[PDB]
Amino acid sequence: AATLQLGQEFQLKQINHQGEEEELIALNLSEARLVIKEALVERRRAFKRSQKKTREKELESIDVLLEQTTGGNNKDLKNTMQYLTNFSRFRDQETVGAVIQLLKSTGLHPFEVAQLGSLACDTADEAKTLIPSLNNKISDDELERILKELSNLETLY
């Protein structure tokens, strides 16, 4: 369950389609929307290429634009985008990139590093109540350190 017990399809050794071992890659609400729209950029980029021969509104107004770009029946993807904007709290990808560099410094398993980014809390104890994974892997003080650093980055856009 939520205690680092994930299936074969979600092991650390996520073999890329080139056939070699690689680390499991998870995504929190700190990268999901900022990668989905970016990929949609490529999608519309080819969509017009081969055709030749706050954050809230930037979410949905462009969601409909890429609904034009996509097949449009994936409105549940739009639900996910909405869920992101309502609860994904990063921007200016270098922001979250510094965050992730710090979390790489944390020596935390990528599941846990995603747990941190996804959750927006105040104390180490709140995390331990929500993330039994993140209770002792680092000093709880360091937990609050990085929680506070997030709160510094916790700015609504």
Partner 1 sequence: MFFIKDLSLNITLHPSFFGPRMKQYLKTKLLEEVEGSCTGKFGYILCVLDYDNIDIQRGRILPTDGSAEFNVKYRAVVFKPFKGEVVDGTVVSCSQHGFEVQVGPMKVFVTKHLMPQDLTFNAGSNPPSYQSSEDVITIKSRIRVKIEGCISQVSSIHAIGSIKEDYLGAI
For partner 1, the binding residues (CB under 8 A) are 1-3, 6, 9-10, 14-17, 24-29, 32, 35-36, 39-40, 42-43, 46, 70-71, 73-74, 76-77, 79-80, 82-84, 86-87, 114, 118-119, 126, 129-132
Question: Which residues on adjacent β-strands are paired with residue 13?
Answer: 23
Bridge partner list, 23: 13
Which two tokens mark 74? 């994936």
Q: How far apart are CA 154 and CA 146, in angstroms?
A: 11
Report the candidate in 14, 13, 10, 63 with the shortest Cα–Cα distance to residue 40: 63
Take residue 56 and report the two structure tokens written for it. Answer: 């809230």
Compare residues 43 and 91 and give the one whose CB is closer to partner 1. Answer: 43
Least distance to partner 1, CB of residue 53, Å: 13
Q: How far apart are CB 104 and partner 1 at their closest, in Å?
A: 16
Give the shortest CB-25-to-partner 1 separation in angstroms.
Answer: 4
